[PDB]
Coordinates of C-alpha atoms in Angstrom, one line a residue:
Chain A
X18 CA 93.4 -19.1 11.4
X19 CA 94.6 -17.3 8.3
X20 CA 97.3 -15.8 10.5
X21 CA 99.6 -18.7 9.7
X22 CA 99.4 -17.9 6.0
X23 CA 101.5 -14.8 6.8
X24 CA 105.3 -15.2 6.6
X25 CA 107.1 -14.2 9.8
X26 CA 110.4 -14.4 11.5
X27 CA 110.8 -15.7 15.1
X28 CA 112.1 -12.8 17.2
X29 CA 110.3 -13.6 20.5
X30 CA 109.7 -17.3 20.6
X31 CA 107.9 -18.3 23.8
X32 CA 104.8 -16.3 24.8
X33 CA 105.6 -13.3 27.0
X34 CA 104.6 -13.5 30.7
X35 CA 101.1 -12.5 31.9
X36 CA 101.4 -11.7 35.6
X37 CA 99.2 -10.8 38.6
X38 CA 100.3 -7.6 40.4
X39 CA 99.4 -8.2 44.0
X40 CA 100.8 -5.0 45.5
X41 CA 99.4 -2.6 42.9
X42 CA 96.1 -4.5 43.2
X43 CA 96.0 -4.2 47.0
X44 CA 96.8 -0.5 46.7
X45 CA 94.2 0.3 44.0
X46 CA 91.6 -2.0 45.5
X47 CA 91.2 -3.7 42.0
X48 CA 92.7 -6.9 40.5
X49 CA 95.3 -5.8 38.0
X50 CA 97.2 -8.1 35.7
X51 CA 100.0 -7.2 33.3
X52 CA 101.0 -8.5 29.9
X53 CA 104.8 -8.3 29.8
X54 CA 105.4 -7.4 26.2
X55 CA 108.3 -5.3 27.5
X56 CA 110.1 -8.6 28.0
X57 CA 111.3 -9.6 24.6
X58 CA 114.9 -10.8 23.8
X59 CA 115.9 -8.2 21.3
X60 CA 117.7 -5.0 22.3
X61 CA 115.7 -4.1 25.5
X62 CA 112.4 -5.3 24.0
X63 CA 108.9 -3.9 23.5
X64 CA 105.7 -4.2 21.4
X65 CA 107.2 -3.1 18.1
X66 CA 109.1 -6.4 17.9
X67 CA 105.8 -8.4 17.4
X68 CA 105.1 -6.2 14.4
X69 CA 108.6 -6.5 13.0
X70 CA 108.2 -10.3 12.9
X71 CA 105.8 -9.9 10.0
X72 CA 107.2 -6.7 8.5
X73 CA 110.8 -8.0 8.2
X74 CA 109.7 -11.4 6.9
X75 CA 108.0 -9.5 4.1
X76 CA 111.2 -7.4 3.6
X77 CA 113.3 -10.6 3.1
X78 CA 110.7 -12.1 0.8
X79 CA 111.0 -9.0 -1.3
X80 CA 114.8 -9.3 -1.3
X81 CA 115.5 -6.1 0.6
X82 CA 119.0 -5.3 1.9
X83 CA 117.9 -2.1 3.7
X84 CA 115.1 -1.3 6.2
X85 CA 113.8 2.3 6.3
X86 CA 111.6 3.7 9.0
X87 CA 110.7 7.0 10.9
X88 CA 110.1 8.2 14.4
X89 CA 111.0 10.7 17.1
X90 CA 114.7 10.8 18.2
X91 CA 113.7 8.6 21.2
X92 CA 111.6 6.2 19.1
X93 CA 111.4 2.6 20.5
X94 CA 110.3 1.4 17.1
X95 CA 113.4 2.8 15.3
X96 CA 115.6 1.2 18.0
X97 CA 114.0 -2.2 17.6
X98 CA 114.1 -1.9 13.8
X99 CA 117.8 -1.0 13.9
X100 CA 118.6 -3.9 16.2
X101 CA 116.7 -6.4 14.0
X102 CA 118.4 -5.0 10.9
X103 CA 121.8 -5.4 12.5
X104 CA 121.0 -9.0 13.5
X105 CA 120.0 -9.9 9.9
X106 CA 122.8 -8.1 8.2
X107 CA 120.5 -5.5 6.7
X108 CA 121.3 -1.8 6.4
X109 CA 119.1 0.6 8.4
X110 CA 118.0 4.1 7.6
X111 CA 116.1 6.1 10.2
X112 CA 114.2 9.3 9.5
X113 CA 114.1 11.2 12.8
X114 CA 112.4 14.3 14.2
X115 CA 112.7 16.2 17.5
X116 CA 109.0 16.4 18.3
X117 CA 109.3 18.5 21.6
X118 CA 111.9 21.2 20.6
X119 CA 114.3 20.1 23.3
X120 CA 118.1 20.7 23.4
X121 CA 118.5 18.5 26.4
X122 CA 121.7 16.4 25.9
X123 CA 120.2 13.1 27.1
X124 CA 117.1 13.3 24.9
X125 CA 119.4 14.1 21.9
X126 CA 122.2 11.6 22.6
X127 CA 121.3 9.0 25.3
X128 CA 118.6 6.3 25.6
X129 CA 117.2 4.9 22.4
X130 CA 119.3 7.4 20.4
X131 CA 122.6 6.0 21.8
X132 CA 121.5 2.5 20.9
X133 CA 120.9 3.6 17.2
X134 CA 124.6 4.5 17.0
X135 CA 125.6 1.1 18.5
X136 CA 123.4 -0.6 15.9
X137 CA 125.1 1.4 13.1
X138 CA 121.9 3.2 12.0
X139 CA 122.2 5.7 9.2
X140 CA 120.5 8.8 10.6
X141 CA 118.5 11.3 8.6
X142 CA 117.2 14.4 10.5
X143 CA 114.1 16.2 9.3
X144 CA 112.4 19.3 10.9
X145 CA 109.1 17.5 11.2
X146 CA 107.3 14.3 10.2
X147 CA 104.4 16.2 8.6
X148 CA 103.7 13.4 6.1
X149 CA 105.7 10.4 7.2
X150 CA 104.4 7.8 4.6
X151 CA 105.2 10.4 1.8
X152 CA 108.6 11.4 3.4
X153 CA 109.6 7.7 3.8
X154 CA 108.8 7.0 0.1
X155 CA 110.9 10.0 -1.0
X156 CA 113.8 8.7 1.1
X157 CA 113.4 5.1 -0.2
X158 CA 113.5 6.3 -3.8
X159 CA 116.8 8.1 -3.2
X160 CA 118.3 5.1 -1.5
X161 CA 116.9 2.8 -4.3
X162 CA 118.4 5.1 -6.9
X163 CA 121.6 5.1 -4.9
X164 CA 122.0 1.4 -5.5
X165 CA 120.2 -0.3 -2.6
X166 CA 117.1 -2.4 -2.2
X167 CA 115.0 -0.6 0.6
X168 CA 111.9 -1.8 2.4
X169 CA 109.8 0.9 4.0
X170 CA 108.4 0.3 7.4
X171 CA 105.7 2.9 8.4
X172 CA 105.7 4.9 11.6
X173 CA 105.6 2.6 14.6
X174 CA 105.3 -0.4 12.3
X175 CA 101.6 0.2 12.2
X176 CA 100.3 -1.3 8.9
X177 CA 97.7 -4.1 8.7
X178 CA 100.6 -6.5 8.2
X179 CA 102.6 -5.2 11.2
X180 CA 99.4 -5.2 13.4
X181 CA 99.2 -9.0 12.9
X182 CA 101.8 -9.1 15.7
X183 CA 99.1 -7.9 18.1
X184 CA 96.5 -10.3 16.8
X185 CA 99.2 -12.8 18.0
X186 CA 99.5 -11.2 21.4
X187 CA 95.7 -11.4 21.8
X188 CA 96.1 -15.2 21.3
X189 CA 98.6 -15.4 24.2
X190 CA 96.3 -13.2 26.3
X191 CA 93.3 -15.4 25.7
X192 CA 95.4 -18.6 26.4
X193 CA 96.9 -17.1 29.6
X194 CA 93.6 -15.8 31.0
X195 CA 91.7 -19.1 31.0
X200 CA 88.8 -10.3 33.2
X201 CA 86.6 -7.3 32.6
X202 CA 89.0 -4.8 31.0
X203 CA 92.2 -4.4 29.0
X204 CA 94.2 -1.2 28.8
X205 CA 96.8 -0.3 26.2
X206 CA 98.6 2.9 25.0
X207 CA 97.2 3.9 21.6
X208 CA 99.8 5.7 19.4
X209 CA 100.4 4.8 15.8
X210 CA 97.4 2.4 16.4
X211 CA 98.7 -0.9 15.2
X212 CA 98.8 -2.4 18.8
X213 CA 95.3 -1.1 19.6
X214 CA 93.8 -2.3 16.3
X215 CA 95.5 -5.8 16.3
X216 CA 94.3 -6.3 19.9
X217 CA 90.8 -5.2 18.9
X218 CA 90.5 -7.8 16.1
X219 CA 91.9 -10.6 18.3
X220 CA 90.0 -9.8 21.5
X221 CA 86.7 -9.4 19.6
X222 CA 87.0 -13.0 18.5
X223 CA 88.7 -14.4 21.5
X224 CA 87.3 -12.6 24.5
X225 CA 84.1 -10.7 23.4
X226 CA 83.0 -9.8 26.9
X227 CA 86.2 -7.8 27.6
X228 CA 86.3 -4.0 27.2
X229 CA 89.4 -2.8 25.3
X230 CA 90.5 0.7 26.2
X231 CA 93.1 2.7 24.3
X232 CA 94.7 5.5 26.2
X233 CA 95.9 8.0 23.6
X234 CA 99.5 9.2 23.8
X235 CA 99.5 11.8 21.0
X236 CA 95.9 12.6 19.8
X237 CA 92.3 13.4 20.8
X238 CA 89.6 10.8 20.5
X239 CA 88.3 12.5 17.3
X240 CA 91.8 12.4 15.6
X241 CA 92.6 8.9 16.8
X242 CA 89.4 6.9 16.3
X243 CA 89.3 6.9 12.5
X244 CA 92.9 5.6 12.5
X245 CA 92.3 2.7 14.8
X246 CA 89.0 1.8 12.9
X247 CA 90.8 1.9 9.5
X248 CA 93.5 -0.5 10.8
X249 CA 90.8 -2.7 12.5
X250 CA 89.0 -3.2 9.2
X251 CA 92.1 -3.8 7.1
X252 CA 93.3 -6.4 9.6
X253 CA 90.0 -8.2 9.7
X254 CA 89.8 -8.1 5.9
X255 CA 93.2 -9.7 5.5
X256 CA 92.3 -12.5 8.0
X257 CA 88.9 -13.0 6.4
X258 CA 87.2 -12.1 9.7
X259 CA 84.4 -9.6 10.7
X260 CA 85.2 -6.7 13.0
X261 CA 82.2 -4.8 14.4
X262 CA 83.3 -4.0 17.9
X263 CA 83.4 -0.4 19.1
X264 CA 86.8 1.3 19.4
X265 CA 87.1 2.8 22.9
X266 CA 89.6 5.7 23.5
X267 CA 90.5 8.0 26.4
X268 CA 92.4 11.1 25.5
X269 CA 92.7 12.8 28.9
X270 CA 96.1 11.5 29.8
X271 CA 98.8 12.8 27.3
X272 CA 98.8 16.6 27.7
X273 CA 100.6 18.8 26.8
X274 CA 101.4 16.4 23.9
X275 CA 103.3 13.5 22.4
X276 CA 106.7 12.7 24.0
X277 CA 106.3 15.2 26.8
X278 CA 106.2 13.7 30.3
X279 CA 103.3 14.7 32.7
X280 CA 102.9 14.3 36.4
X281 CA 100.2 11.7 36.4
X282 CA 102.4 9.7 34.0
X283 CA 105.6 10.0 36.0
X284 CA 103.7 9.2 39.1
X285 CA 102.4 6.0 37.4
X286 CA 106.1 5.1 36.7
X287 CA 107.0 5.6 40.4
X288 CA 104.0 3.6 41.6
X289 CA 104.7 0.5 39.4
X290 CA 108.5 0.7 40.2
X291 CA 108.0 1.0 44.0
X292 CA 105.1 -1.5 44.3
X293 CA 106.0 -4.1 41.7
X294 CA 109.6 -3.6 40.5
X295 CA 108.2 -2.9 37.1
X296 CA 109.6 -0.2 34.8
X297 CA 107.2 1.9 32.7
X298 CA 108.2 4.9 30.5
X299 CA 107.4 8.6 30.3
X300 CA 106.1 8.7 26.8
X301 CA 103.8 5.6 26.5
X302 CA 103.1 3.2 29.3
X303 CA 103.2 5.7 32.2
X304 CA 100.5 7.7 30.5
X305 CA 98.5 4.6 29.7
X306 CA 98.8 3.5 33.4
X307 CA 97.8 7.0 34.6
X308 CA 94.7 6.4 32.5
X309 CA 94.1 3.0 34.0
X310 CA 94.4 4.4 37.5
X311 CA 92.0 7.4 36.8
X312 CA 89.5 5.0 35.2
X313 CA 89.4 3.3 38.6
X314 CA 89.0 6.7 40.4
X315 CA 86.3 7.9 38.0
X316 CA 84.6 4.5 37.7
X317 CA 85.1 4.8 34.0
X318 CA 85.4 1.2 32.9
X319 CA 82.2 -0.7 31.8
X320 CA 82.3 -2.7 35.0
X321 CA 84.6 -3.0 37.9
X322 CA 86.3 -6.4 37.5
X323 CA 89.9 -7.4 36.8
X324 CA 92.0 -5.1 34.5
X325 CA 94.8 -6.3 32.2
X326 CA 97.4 -3.7 31.5
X327 CA 99.4 -4.2 28.3
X328 CA 103.1 -3.4 28.9
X329 CA 104.3 -2.3 25.5
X330 CA 107.8 -1.5 26.7
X331 CA 109.6 1.9 26.4
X332 CA 111.8 1.8 29.5
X333 CA 115.1 2.8 27.7
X334 CA 113.5 6.2 27.3
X335 CA 113.8 6.7 31.1
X336 CA 117.5 7.4 30.6
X337 CA 116.9 9.9 27.8
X338 CA 114.3 11.9 29.7
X339 CA 116.4 12.1 32.9
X340 CA 116.9 14.6 34.4
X341 CA 114.4 16.7 32.4
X342 CA 113.3 17.6 28.9
Chain B
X15 CA 121.3 -37.2 39.1
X16 CA 124.5 -35.6 40.6
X17 CA 123.0 -32.1 41.2
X18 CA 119.9 -33.4 43.1
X19 CA 120.7 -31.8 46.5
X20 CA 120.0 -28.5 44.7
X21 CA 116.3 -29.4 45.2
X22 CA 116.8 -28.9 49.0
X23 CA 117.3 -25.1 48.9
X24 CA 114.1 -23.1 48.9
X25 CA 114.0 -20.6 46.0
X26 CA 111.7 -17.9 44.5
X27 CA 110.5 -17.9 40.9
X28 CA 111.9 -14.7 39.3
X29 CA 112.9 -16.1 35.8
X30 CA 110.3 -18.8 35.0
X31 CA 111.3 -20.4 31.7
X32 CA 115.0 -21.2 30.8
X33 CA 116.6 -18.2 29.2
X34 CA 117.3 -18.5 25.4
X35 CA 120.5 -20.0 24.2
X36 CA 121.2 -18.7 20.7
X37 CA 123.6 -19.2 17.9
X38 CA 125.4 -16.0 16.7
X39 CA 125.8 -16.5 12.9
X40 CA 127.2 -13.1 12.0
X41 CA 129.6 -12.9 14.9
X42 CA 130.6 -16.5 14.2
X43 CA 131.2 -15.7 10.5
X44 CA 133.4 -12.8 11.5
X45 CA 135.4 -14.7 14.2
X46 CA 135.7 -17.9 12.2
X47 CA 134.3 -20.1 14.9
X48 CA 130.9 -21.2 16.2
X49 CA 129.7 -18.7 18.9
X50 CA 126.6 -19.3 21.0
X51 CA 125.2 -17.0 23.6
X52 CA 123.4 -17.7 26.9
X53 CA 120.9 -14.9 27.2
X54 CA 120.8 -14.3 31.0
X55 CA 120.4 -10.6 30.2
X56 CA 116.8 -11.6 29.2
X57 CA 115.0 -12.0 32.4
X58 CA 111.7 -10.4 33.4
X59 CA 112.8 -8.3 36.3
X60 CA 113.9 -4.7 35.8
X61 CA 116.1 -5.0 32.8
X62 CA 117.5 -8.5 33.8
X63 CA 120.9 -9.9 34.5
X64 CA 122.9 -12.8 36.2
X65 CA 122.3 -11.4 39.7
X66 CA 118.6 -12.3 39.5
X67 CA 119.6 -16.0 39.4
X68 CA 121.4 -15.6 42.8
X69 CA 118.6 -13.5 44.3
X70 CA 116.2 -16.4 43.8
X71 CA 118.1 -18.4 46.5
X72 CA 119.3 -15.4 48.6
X73 CA 115.8 -13.8 48.9
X74 CA 114.1 -17.2 49.6
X75 CA 116.5 -17.6 52.4
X76 CA 115.7 -14.0 53.7
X77 CA 112.0 -14.8 53.7
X78 CA 112.4 -18.1 55.5
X79 CA 114.1 -16.3 58.4
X80 CA 111.4 -13.6 58.5
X81 CA 113.5 -10.7 57.2
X82 CA 111.7 -7.7 55.9
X83 CA 114.7 -5.7 54.7
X84 CA 117.5 -6.5 52.2
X85 CA 120.9 -4.8 52.7
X86 CA 123.7 -5.0 50.1
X87 CA 126.6 -3.0 48.6
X88 CA 128.0 -2.1 45.2
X89 CA 129.2 0.6 42.9
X90 CA 126.8 3.5 42.1
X91 CA 126.2 1.6 38.8
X92 CA 126.0 -1.9 40.4
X93 CA 123.6 -4.2 38.5
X94 CA 123.2 -6.3 41.7
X95 CA 122.0 -3.4 43.8
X96 CA 119.5 -2.5 41.0
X97 CA 118.2 -6.1 40.8
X98 CA 118.1 -6.5 44.6
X99 CA 116.1 -3.2 44.9
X100 CA 113.7 -4.3 42.2
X101 CA 113.1 -7.6 43.9
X102 CA 112.6 -5.9 47.2
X103 CA 110.0 -3.6 45.8
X104 CA 108.1 -6.5 44.2
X105 CA 108.1 -8.4 47.4
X106 CA 107.3 -5.4 49.6
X107 CA 110.6 -5.7 51.4
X108 CA 112.6 -2.6 52.3
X109 CA 116.0 -2.2 50.7
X110 CA 119.2 -0.4 51.9
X111 CA 122.1 0.0 49.5
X112 CA 125.7 0.9 50.5
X113 CA 127.2 2.6 47.5
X114 CA 130.7 3.8 46.5
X115 CA 132.1 5.7 43.5
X116 CA 134.8 3.2 42.5
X117 CA 136.3 5.3 39.6
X118 CA 136.3 8.8 41.2
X119 CA 134.1 10.2 38.4
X120 CA 132.1 13.4 38.6
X121 CA 130.3 12.7 35.3
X122 CA 126.6 13.4 35.9
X123 CA 125.2 10.4 33.9
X124 CA 127.4 8.1 36.0
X125 CA 126.3 9.8 39.2
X126 CA 122.5 10.0 38.5
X127 CA 121.6 8.0 35.3
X128 CA 121.4 4.3 34.4
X129 CA 121.2 1.8 37.3
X130 CA 121.4 4.7 39.8
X131 CA 118.3 6.3 38.4
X132 CA 116.3 3.1 38.8
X133 CA 117.4 2.8 42.5
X134 CA 115.3 6.0 43.2
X135 CA 112.3 4.5 41.4
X136 CA 112.4 1.4 43.6
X137 CA 112.5 3.6 46.8
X138 CA 115.9 2.3 47.8
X139 CA 117.4 3.7 51.0
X140 CA 120.8 5.0 49.7
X141 CA 123.8 5.0 52.0
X142 CA 127.0 6.5 50.6
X143 CA 130.6 5.6 51.6
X144 CA 134.1 6.8 50.5
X145 CA 135.1 3.3 49.5
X146 CA 134.1 -0.4 50.1
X147 CA 137.4 -1.2 51.9
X148 CA 135.8 -4.0 53.9
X149 CA 132.2 -4.7 52.6
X150 CA 131.4 -7.5 55.1
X151 CA 132.2 -5.3 58.1
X152 CA 130.6 -2.2 56.6
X153 CA 127.4 -4.1 55.7
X154 CA 127.2 -5.5 59.2
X155 CA 127.7 -2.0 60.8
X156 CA 124.9 -0.7 58.6
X157 CA 122.6 -3.7 59.5
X158 CA 123.1 -2.9 63.2
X159 CA 121.9 0.6 62.7
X160 CA 119.0 -0.6 60.4
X161 CA 117.9 -3.2 63.1
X162 CA 117.9 -0.5 65.8
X163 CA 115.0 1.2 63.8
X164 CA 113.0 -2.1 64.1
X165 CA 113.7 -3.5 60.7
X166 CA 114.7 -7.2 60.3
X167 CA 117.7 -6.9 57.9
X168 CA 119.1 -9.7 55.7
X169 CA 122.6 -8.9 54.5
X170 CA 123.4 -9.8 50.9
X171 CA 127.1 -9.7 50.2
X172 CA 128.7 -7.8 47.2
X173 CA 127.4 -9.2 43.9
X174 CA 125.2 -11.7 45.7
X175 CA 128.2 -14.0 45.7
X176 CA 127.9 -16.5 48.5
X177 CA 127.8 -20.3 48.1
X178 CA 124.0 -20.0 48.4
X179 CA 123.8 -17.2 45.9
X180 CA 126.0 -19.2 43.5
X181 CA 123.4 -22.0 43.5
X182 CA 121.6 -19.9 40.9
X183 CA 124.5 -20.6 38.4
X184 CA 124.6 -24.3 39.2
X185 CA 121.0 -24.2 38.0
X186 CA 122.1 -22.2 35.0
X187 CA 124.5 -25.0 34.1
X188 CA 121.7 -27.5 34.2
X189 CA 119.8 -25.4 31.6
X190 CA 122.9 -25.0 29.5
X191 CA 123.5 -28.8 29.5
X192 CA 119.9 -29.5 28.5
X193 CA 119.9 -26.8 25.9
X194 CA 123.1 -28.0 24.2
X195 CA 122.0 -31.7 24.4
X196 CA 121.8 -33.2 20.9
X197 CA 122.1 -29.7 19.4
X198 CA 125.7 -28.6 20.0
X199 CA 128.9 -30.1 21.4
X200 CA 130.5 -27.1 23.2
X201 CA 134.2 -26.9 23.6
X202 CA 134.3 -23.7 25.7
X203 CA 132.3 -21.4 27.9
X204 CA 133.2 -17.7 28.6
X205 CA 131.9 -15.7 31.5
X206 CA 132.9 -12.4 33.2
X207 CA 134.5 -13.1 36.6
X208 CA 133.8 -10.4 39.1
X209 CA 132.6 -11.2 42.7
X210 CA 133.0 -14.8 41.5
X211 CA 129.6 -16.4 42.2
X212 CA 128.6 -16.8 38.6
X213 CA 132.0 -18.3 37.6
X214 CA 132.0 -20.6 40.7
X215 CA 128.4 -21.8 40.2
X216 CA 129.1 -22.6 36.6
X217 CA 132.4 -24.3 37.5
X218 CA 130.6 -26.8 39.8
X219 CA 127.6 -27.3 37.5
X220 CA 129.7 -27.8 34.3
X221 CA 132.2 -30.1 36.0
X222 CA 129.3 -32.5 36.7
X223 CA 127.2 -32.1 33.6
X224 CA 129.7 -31.3 30.9
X225 CA 133.1 -32.4 32.3
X226 CA 135.0 -31.9 28.9
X227 CA 133.9 -28.3 28.4
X228 CA 136.6 -25.7 29.3
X229 CA 135.2 -22.9 31.4
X230 CA 137.0 -19.5 31.2
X231 CA 136.4 -16.5 33.4
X232 CA 137.6 -13.1 32.1
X233 CA 138.4 -11.0 35.2
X234 CA 136.9 -7.6 35.3
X235 CA 138.5 -6.2 38.5
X236 CA 141.5 -8.3 39.6
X237 CA 144.5 -10.3 38.4
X238 CA 144.5 -14.1 38.2
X239 CA 146.6 -14.2 41.5
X240 CA 143.9 -12.1 43.3
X241 CA 140.8 -13.6 41.7
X242 CA 141.7 -17.3 41.5
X243 CA 141.5 -18.0 45.3
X244 CA 138.1 -16.2 45.5
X245 CA 136.6 -18.5 42.8
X246 CA 138.1 -21.7 44.3
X247 CA 136.8 -20.9 47.8
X248 CA 133.2 -20.5 46.4
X249 CA 133.6 -23.6 44.1
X250 CA 134.6 -25.7 47.1
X251 CA 131.9 -24.2 49.3
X252 CA 129.2 -24.8 46.6
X253 CA 130.4 -28.4 46.1
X254 CA 130.3 -29.1 49.8
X255 CA 126.8 -27.8 50.1
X256 CA 125.7 -30.2 47.3
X257 CA 127.6 -33.2 48.8
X258 CA 129.9 -33.3 45.7
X259 CA 133.6 -33.0 45.0
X260 CA 134.9 -30.4 42.5
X261 CA 138.4 -31.3 41.2
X262 CA 138.4 -29.0 38.1
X263 CA 141.1 -26.4 37.7
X264 CA 139.6 -22.8 37.6
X265 CA 140.7 -20.9 34.5
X266 CA 141.0 -17.1 34.5
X267 CA 142.3 -14.5 32.0
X268 CA 143.2 -11.1 33.4
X269 CA 144.4 -9.3 30.3
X270 CA 141.1 -7.5 29.6
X271 CA 140.1 -5.3 32.4
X272 CA 142.9 -2.6 32.6
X273 CA 143.0 0.2 33.7
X274 CA 140.7 -1.2 36.4
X275 CA 137.2 -2.1 37.6
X276 CA 134.5 0.1 36.1
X277 CA 136.9 1.9 33.7
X278 CA 136.0 1.3 30.0
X279 CA 138.8 0.2 27.6
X280 CA 139.2 0.2 23.9
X281 CA 138.9 -3.6 23.4
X282 CA 135.8 -3.6 25.5
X283 CA 134.1 -0.8 23.6
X284 CA 135.1 -2.4 20.3
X285 CA 133.5 -5.6 21.6
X286 CA 130.3 -3.7 22.5
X287 CA 130.2 -2.1 19.0
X288 CA 130.8 -5.4 17.4
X289 CA 128.0 -7.3 19.1
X290 CA 125.6 -4.4 18.5
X291 CA 126.4 -4.0 14.8
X292 CA 126.6 -7.7 14.0
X293 CA 124.0 -9.3 16.2
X294 CA 121.7 -6.5 17.6
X295 CA 122.9 -7.6 21.1
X296 CA 123.8 -5.0 23.8
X297 CA 126.8 -5.6 26.0
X298 CA 128.1 -3.2 28.7
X299 CA 131.4 -1.4 29.3
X300 CA 132.1 -2.8 32.8
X301 CA 131.4 -6.5 32.5
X302 CA 130.3 -8.2 29.3
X303 CA 132.2 -5.9 26.9
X304 CA 135.4 -6.8 28.6
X305 CA 134.5 -10.5 28.8
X306 CA 133.7 -10.5 25.0
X307 CA 137.0 -8.8 24.3
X308 CA 138.6 -11.7 26.2
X309 CA 136.7 -14.3 24.1
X310 CA 137.6 -12.5 20.8
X311 CA 141.3 -12.3 21.7
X312 CA 141.2 -15.9 23.0
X313 CA 140.3 -16.9 19.5
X314 CA 142.9 -14.6 18.0
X315 CA 145.7 -16.1 20.2
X316 CA 144.3 -19.6 20.3
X317 CA 144.1 -19.5 24.1
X318 CA 141.3 -22.1 24.2
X319 CA 142.2 -25.7 24.9
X320 CA 140.2 -26.8 21.8
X321 CA 139.0 -24.6 18.9
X322 CA 135.4 -26.0 18.9
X323 CA 132.1 -24.0 19.7
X324 CA 132.2 -21.4 22.4
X325 CA 129.3 -20.4 24.6
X326 CA 129.4 -16.8 25.9
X327 CA 127.4 -16.2 29.1
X328 CA 125.6 -12.9 28.7
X329 CA 125.4 -11.8 32.3
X330 CA 123.6 -8.5 31.5
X331 CA 124.7 -5.0 32.4
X332 CA 123.2 -2.9 29.5
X333 CA 121.7 -0.2 31.7
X334 CA 125.2 1.0 32.5
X335 CA 125.6 2.0 28.8
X336 CA 123.4 5.0 29.6
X337 CA 125.4 5.9 32.7
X338 CA 128.8 5.7 30.9
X339 CA 127.6 7.9 28.0
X340 CA 129.1 10.2 26.9
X341 CA 132.2 9.6 29.1
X342 CA 133.2 9.2 32.7

């Protein structure tokens, strides 16, 4: 209810499709549905756009002329922020790292990174995002002292404000489903947490599972919980639901493809004409599939996979590294 | 009323809702004229595009006749082939693609990245040829060999551009008319003109719904002399199928595609950079970049019949950006 008290820009408009996947369902022997948050009208789309609706509205209210964020070279978030900035006539400054130590030309210059150049993003390279919030604040102070009005967007757009975007997706989900499980990639945690708050109130019987793409359960759980509480607090709701996380599917680490993940990509492509990605959704789908094999879900009814986007990264990861 | 026979053709649901029609305030401010964009690049299937509109009718036709295989042709970086392959996968139809290298490039990203990468993901059977000198005959030869294996092939022509395929853009015109209604009085529409189905579909639709609007195709592969009869033939065939006449003159501009099909040019790349930096919109080096360069220059030279609002049809093509980088 209090969701409408938050300023937001319209970047998406109509609710994204929720689709049945008959061929994948037939193959896995389980009813699988997909939330197509990969289909959004801005610069090849994705989940970060839902967050930016709130974050950029806040930016404009604060009178910013510059958006500053951070991510890997192949960040979907940075690409979406850069496109949104260009659309609104805002400057954009991206703080980037190479998280996998690659020198592969396509990772360094193609995919999302190519798009950043098209969007006229000012690029700042750092050796590592060891303390992103801190490093972004340092950068913002320079730019502010330089004569600009920056607005800092945290890594993956995952603040309590940004995460409102995924409380919003939860409303679409609830509307469109009128299910036993929901599966989503859990990275910077805004998507997971927002969905957790929304689904708790809208679909309490449904098990929400985050498949981690960068961290162990131990490392990831406190982050998702912290966001869950902050979101609930700002909406004047209670959030008591357990956070469920599966960390078996991201090795050897963030932004490195693995076989299970790339095989998930091939499966969805060949069976459904759907495009996943090597960093996020492929790994999450690999988790979904294994959850079936291992009978890992609370019960064995329909599963909703949340497609958070990421496909432009296919072109940066080809042919390897 | 006049486009009612369109109801008769069976068609599949690939798009769902009408695609967004958006004002471009920053581009409009720069160009000194009201620019709107029809977002046909924003469709739900495998990175979208205009070809998906045609496939709705072509594939419905294939299913009706009991086909289990789709066969079509294009460049290695064809958007059509990629969209055909994606649809085939989704429907559990087999897909065979006859590909050529139209520009003689050895650049690895052209050969293996972009649309061509996606083809492998959709399990497309790839069939290379030196050139598409006679695509109708080459597709038919391939269909004979495919049929010998026991498949039931349905041949989709280059770009999905038959009268039936073009019905998708008659439908697009209906959307456009409804979307502009009481919101904007369009003076002009710009679309890239390639295999001609999109242009022809729009020509018939717009003649009957928005008769005063000037439709302009920017050629991406041929001169006016070569392209114009192709568009007209389709236009007349589309009108016939709908029990309508189509008396409108087809308008084409061929100044914006040199040195040739699939070869990027400066004006095209500047248009791509302009749309990206001003509107966060991604065009492509083969089709939309060149069409936009046409629009821009059309404003500059006052080539349009009337200087009112222009609607640019975004036909898609963005995955090729990754194939054309860093060069071909």
